[PDB]
Symmetry: C4
Subunit: 385 residues, 4 copies
């Protein structure tokens, strides 16, 4: 039975720890994969951590990591949440160096992009069997979310970008059913920059908060209806979401240029005019992580908010973070659970090692209360190398 | 179908071995988690061993174990009974440094506490999805059973403590249905100290034998109806069940203060006025274990009992122990099976290693006869370190 | 639905290879249990390999193996046929240093004996939960088949022995259902000696071909009905099946003393007055294996037989072997498929290592023709130790 | 419900990446089997990777590899597609130094041949249980596909060879039902040489394109109906498909002798008079790989073709490749989906190590577009040896 996306984000007051895989600590001795962007996505029955791997284990020569980001050895795989991703507990999903995945309530749709930078191609797989293909339309690094795609009413959607990671690039939103692109639209988003979008369903529409790697310290967003009729803008909140960024001053609804000329995959959840923002604690490094509730900051420009829930201390590394959803059909709830996962990145380039991998921690919505704390990766570097 | 807890504990003459995971021996080379409190719990179909990990494997630098007991890496996981807990074979359950779990006939209820000591939050999950949150109400290390909770008529129950592990603390009994607290009661138990409760259902009610870390050598207990109407007291037998403890002299039905101002998670099974006391063989160390049947001993003070069955020889190390039950819905029996597990602690503080982990063995009730013997951990220490 | 054991053994011409796990060779690097007696047994749906482990892995110090045969760490487990037994693919069955198992069409019956030599106890489990217990009745190493028991008409049967491994011992046949011993009989077998029986159903009855460790070079047998009314004897064939043994001279229908004073778990299939005998090739060691078809040989004394199918060369080590059965409920055949398995033992006492473990190979019945060959263990000893 | 093979090959334009296991890169630390000929075959629900192993893991002394190809330790196993084959994730299929496998829509049929060169025997299994045997009829290395067999309307087919791998050999086609040979036919192919056939169903008929190890640079083929009524020939195209082979000149419909006096296992898909040809890029080594579409090149001789899609750069190693198929009962499509896998051989004889193993990559049919690229093994040799 197809996942209805008609309900709304549940009302929350904080975030409860949902999972911590300790991959890198476990991986010191265990056969753990060296990985990146470990995003979570759920079905009507279970939740899985997807991730991309260079096809190498921690503490092996092959973790050498000097390799180009986009190698032909990169693969999308998944394992059950909270488990250290190893070759013994991971299901192969697709060959790719950028990807997303989501479940329509019936089957898994995975989207693995691979090939050369000037002709990369996205392979879509419904229940593991290739169902469609998408080719680079700009011949300049076709790439996608690196987190869950969103499904509604039997249709799933994703955002892909092709073009420079500096100036303008091209952005298309795709609508697919049973792994087949039935429709697609190129956003008319001049002066906007979209990368690694974190999308989620809400009352039959999709919202995505993304990364602006070109020229914005705040994050750009796009929300569209099942017919790909959209709207775009930037979280106006002066609690800037991107990293690097400037100190929290006065925000704006289009690209904040001071310091926002790079970035990190992140997310944000829109509540009315308010925003729950996840972000690194540091303004320079992918260190620390905190959730911030700025009621009415999605439209207003302030530096003030009302709640801050710590997640990872500034003294410990973080990295990519993205959002994921639990549908009522999995929960029994009468709303959609917003949840998020954080990538705790270790090694290069901030640490003196030959490799780079990450741990995940994830949290979920919830009305009852929570607490802030620090759930860092916890590995002692460097490794036997 | 919900688990009816209306039958009573099955009459028993002794305890037959049920399982032994050999985790620490296998861990010498295998990828086994370093763990603590591997309690067992069963559903209407199978039994699983739950345990807590620091997220490190045996024989690996990260099992350094100089970390605070309650680190943010401690996680609750489970694997089939008798298997070595490894990331290749364990299911992630929850992020926690204290917890319990129990199945109600439908799904697993897991309860994992994490967070700082001045406001730990218990996250309750039903079938893997968060269903409730309980906050510390004293802001002083909120903690729970470290063993199977008890379900009856579709409602599950547990006991949590908040406050000091020395003097008076606050104790509450929780009642939840489908992972949600539907009723809670604070016990009016001045002079009492409850910690790491071993609870079990009997005839529609729950009886818990716990640990008094404050000032008792005998174990305190609580029993309660499905409406949290309760009774409390201490095991009066002069066969003191805690550890440390004094030599078996004359008990009392309120905390025996000679020598019992510390302790160890243990259990006991009440039959009528008698008791099966599980406890260590030594009175100073967590070494050896034995089962003891002091009939007319739960209400009476003596030193005399009728049976003693050896489990682990004074010469070997033991540790936490807890009860678990096997319901007729799993068993086919017309009564509830009393079972228990014993944690075989190796390493620190009694050995000269840099870690602490434990193996597990369990036994079940039984009418037929058994044999006393010694099923110790069996690992050679130290390890390659 | 209960396995009907009413059909007869299928007629056969030779044995086709069924499996080979390579455990020891794989075990040089992989995490493989050091095991003994990996007998195979099947249900109505799958076949599984059971085996006993010392709770240790190949190439780790704990395989030190100087440990008594009967240690409290010994456990009964199982993994799918053909797979190397590791703590990552094996199910835990029971704590045991002697064992047997068999499926009745509904659930698995396992029997694991543990405890001291003067009072061992056999734990029976039906679907993993304890259903009965049997204590030593001579207080001298209660012990069992180390191979599949036999089920017919929803009752399973096994043979246990208690008493010395030299002179007269005591022999009992247990009839159990749903894992509960519903009847037992002590064989009245003066001058007989039964250990490690390999039993199989045929035409509603059970026949077991065992090992005489006391004074026989020929194998003793027992066959009984569902009411435990039995008959007994020795394979009369001069193609002596035990090991050690003399050169094939003239056999006798009661113990052949010469050279018959020790032995190895073996099996044999009776077909009318003929026997399919499996035995080692050497007469002083456990090396080589061959299936021999001596028609008119179970009741006659000859040295002559019609067929010999090599299985393991004399230049390679073998060990225990036993029979396991297919039933027409798992096969679709109108008869019972006789199969067998052979244990390839490497290490001590024949080899200069610190451990002993074995690999497994299996073959089945089959009407079509096969080929004799040699399927040895294939590991290079000694190991990294 | 049995798999109908009544539909035609789906029309296609190129090949989308389906999987990459990186087994070598991973085996560098992880416990992965050293394998050869990892063919893929699918059921109506999943696709698995079958491979053959020597019973040894990478980076362990048992991969020493000086061993005859045809050892008694060689086994057929399978694991999900895209996963690294390890004893922890692979299922045991059969003892075999040559094999094939296919699912008939109901259960899997595996064909494993083992035994000595003068009289090997193909053991057939249906759903894990032996269902027939086929003995060498020339006593000179009976051998089969090393790739998926073809199933149609409930009958599966395979091709085996017996005889010299130089001069005339003997070649037979077999039709089986429920793993039982129901009909076989010897090809009347004087001057032809068939080995390691890649077969596939098309419109209720099977087509196989094989290896001529005797005196052919082009590949020989056999197509047959459900009654084993057949036809034979060679791919006439001057786009020589074997390796070694000469530079692409003018070919012939009968064995091209220039340089095709050895070879490598391969495939091609027939569409009308056209042919999709999968082949290595070098004419001397098993290096690189590419798909070429030579329309009107299955019946014609040219050096001209229309499309060339790269799969592995000339600069990297490659190996066996085979066709597998996806049926409509699995895909939902209305036609049979052609796919292929490529074996990426590392080590001996081309590199300086003591072992030989292969990774795998695979691609499927597809109407949308794709891209040529290189997806090499990526392992750094030599290993710690
Ligand atoms: C014996 C003929 C056959 C083709 C030449 O040899 C194959 C060549 C191989 C090869 O050249 O890659 C390896 C195969 N595993 C082998 N199979 C057998 C049956 O031994």
């Amino acid at each position: 039975v197809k996942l209805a996306g008609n309900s709304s984000l549940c009302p929350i007051n904080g975030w409860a720890v949902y999972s911590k895989d300790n991959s890198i600590r476990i991986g010191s001795k265990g056969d753990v994969f060296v990985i990146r962007e470990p995003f979570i996505s759920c079905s009507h029955l279970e939740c899985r951590t997807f991730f991309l791997t260079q096809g190498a284990l921690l503490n092996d020569k092959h973790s050498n990591g000097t390799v180009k980001d986009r190698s032909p050895h990169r693969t999308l795989m998944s394992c059950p949440v909270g488990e250290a991703p190893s070759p013994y507990n991971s299901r192969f999903e697709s060959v790719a160096w950028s990807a997303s995945a989501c479940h329509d309530g019936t089957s898994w749709l995975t989207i693995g992009i691979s090939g050369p930078d000037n002709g990369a191609v996205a392979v879509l797989k419904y229940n593991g069997i290739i169902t469609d293909t998408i080719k680079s339309w700009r011949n300049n690094i076709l790439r996608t979310q690196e987190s869950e795609c969103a499904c509604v009413n039997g249709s799933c959607f994703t955002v892909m970008t092709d073009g420079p990671s500096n100036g303008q690039a091209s952005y298309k939103i795709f609508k697919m059913e049973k792994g087949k692109v039935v429709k697609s639209v190129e956003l008319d988003a001049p002066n906007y920059h979209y990368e690694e979008c974190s999308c989620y369903p809400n009352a039959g529409e999709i919202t995505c908060v993304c990364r602006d790697n070109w020229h914005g310290s705040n994050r750009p967003w796009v929300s569209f209806n099942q017919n790909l009729e959209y709207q775009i803008g930037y979280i106006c909140s002066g609690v800037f979401g991107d990293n690097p960024r400037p100190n929290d001053g006065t925000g704006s609804c289009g690209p904040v240029s001071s310091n926002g000329a790079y970035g990190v995959k992140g997310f944000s959840f829109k509540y009315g005019n308010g925003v729950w923002i996840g972000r690194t604690k540091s303004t320079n490094s992918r260190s620390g992580f905190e959730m911030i509730w700025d009621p009415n900051g999605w439209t207003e420009t302030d530096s003030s908010f009302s709640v801050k829930q710590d997640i990872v201390a500034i003294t410990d590394w973080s990295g990519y973070s993205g959002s994921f959803v639990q549908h009522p059909e999995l929960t029994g709830l009468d709303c959609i659970r917003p949840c998020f996962w954080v990538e705790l990145i270790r090694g290069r380039p901030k640490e003196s090692t030959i490799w780079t991998s990450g741990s995940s921690i994830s949290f979920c919505g919830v009305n009852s209360d929570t607490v802030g704390w620090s759930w860092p990766d916890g590995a002692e570097l460097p490794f036997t190398i």
